[PDB]
């Protein structure tokens, strides 16, 4: 169920400064490379330790690629101002997501190439890698321009070929590091909250990767319509945190059981309130 | 490796 993704951003700035360009590469949703035009000495930089493998030429040529992309976004931003007949002295964002999904058979599942202007979908390559979807009229100008130049043939060639070739290479190079997981340590807390009722809250900490499920249940059944759940959040050390919580009556806390499902867990933890 | 674009928008 594997993937590569390169996320790219350009931001216009009113005044003397050219647009800021940031490119981030992801393997299996794990950041491994970054480029930032605002850096002191702008180049692609490794992020995971397993990329220090690659030699000077890799960095040097990827850095040269970035610098061409930078100009590409600079020119694309300008053209877009013209299309939407926008005024000068604004800050506008251009964004690109691009990559390939992969089976365990090392075979292309899906190719992705899409753009957004001002956080709205602008243009995207369709699943076939041959045709385009244009969100508005300005995008339709682009679509025509790209049909006449034969752009999709070239994106296709990158996606089916080079994206996939390179995703293979990266998974072989950092096999030990993507394997890593961290078990949730979980506990329950008790928060005399109102008059009559309490809050029970199931924490899960120290865990990686981020994906996780927490469930409260009362005597067989699952309590989804009366539960409060928080978006999963990073600790900042590499691990993650999440908690789920329920509003129960005092005295009957032993009835309720929390449950925690995770990849790195050899079996799902079940939990109950203790004094 | 990273994608590279062709014609500008």
């Amino acid at each position, epitope marked *: 169920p594997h993937s590569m993704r390169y996320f790219e951003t350009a931001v216009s700035r009113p005044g003397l400064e050219e647009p800021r360009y940031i490119s981030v590469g992801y393997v299996d949703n794990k950041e491994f490379v970054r480029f930032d035009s605002d850096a002191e000495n702008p180049r692609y930089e490794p992020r995971a330790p397993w990329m220090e493998q690659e030699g000077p030429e890799y960095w040097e*040529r990827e850095t*040269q*690629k970035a610098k*061409g*992309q930078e*100009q*590409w976004f*600079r*020119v694309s931003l300008r053209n877009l101002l013209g299309y939407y007949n926008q005024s000068a002295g604004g800050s506008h964002t251009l964004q690109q997501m691009s990559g390939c999904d992969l089976g365990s058979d090392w075979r292309l599942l899906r190719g992705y190439l899409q753009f957004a202007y001002e956080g709205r979908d602008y243009i995207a390559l369709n699943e076939d890698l041959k045709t385009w979807t244009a969100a508005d009229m300005a995008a339709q100008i682009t679509r025509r321009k790209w049909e006449q*130049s034969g752009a999709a*043939e*070239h994106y296709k*060639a990158y996606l*089916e*070929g*080079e994206c996939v070739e390179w995703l293979h290479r990266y998974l072989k190079n950092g096999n030990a590091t993507l394997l890593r997981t961290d078990s949730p340590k979980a506990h329950v807390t008790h928060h005399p909250r109102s008059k009559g009722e309490v809050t029970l809250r199931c924490w899960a900490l120290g865990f990686y990767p981020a994906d996780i499920t927490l469930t409260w249940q009362l005597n067989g059944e699952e309590l989804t319509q009366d539960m409060e759940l928080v978006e999963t959040r990073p600790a900042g050390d590499g691990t993650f945190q999440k908690w789920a919580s329920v509003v129960v009556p005092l005295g009957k806390e032993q009835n309720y059981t929390c449950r925690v499902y995770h990849e790195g867990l050899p079996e799902p933890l079940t939990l109950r309130w203790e004094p | 490796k990273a994608p*590279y*674009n*062709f*014609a*500008t928008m």
Partner: T-cell receptor
Amino acid sequence: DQQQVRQSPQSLTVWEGGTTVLTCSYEDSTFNYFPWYQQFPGEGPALLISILSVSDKKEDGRFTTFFNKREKKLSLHIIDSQPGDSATYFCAALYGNEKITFGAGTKLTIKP
Amino acid sequence: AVTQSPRSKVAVTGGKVTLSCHQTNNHDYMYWYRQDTGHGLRLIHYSYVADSTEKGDIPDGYKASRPSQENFSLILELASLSQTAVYFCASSDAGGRNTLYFGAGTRLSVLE
């Protein structure tokens, strides 16, 4: 130093009606886009036809290019050689969005 | 359209010579190329925006200049005999693999 694109021959004269074969070798195995540029006397170079690594042949009518990744060589074949076709033909290669790298160019005279 | 001037130029060794180019493609990338007796297209200087220029493969003895987006100029401060050659301007959209549109050429003889 580093002949990244080697073109042969330098001048090629052929009798009208023949087929011309220009050949080209590149060093950098990563190159994955190869345009050919055609230069009529007194005019500037202009793009003739192009092929990507992923294909083995591209053909626009009379002109047709042959990529071959393994032997790391590329070639142009013109089939009904008219004198209109007399010009310098330039072989090019590049990776990704790097800048184009031209050959020294083969001068083709199609004798009428 | 890419349009150079002057179309021909004679100069004395040590003179100042200045080749000019204009284009109306609204392209950001512009280029100065050198050809030697019909062979070769070696890059001297290019530019992806005014008022900056960047070094090419053969910059020694040459200096470029990009006042407008429309105009691009190559400048020889002291012309040598070895800078006798034909020169081509080109333009292209930013991004990868865009086609070079070349001017029609400028001939330069440099003489003792």
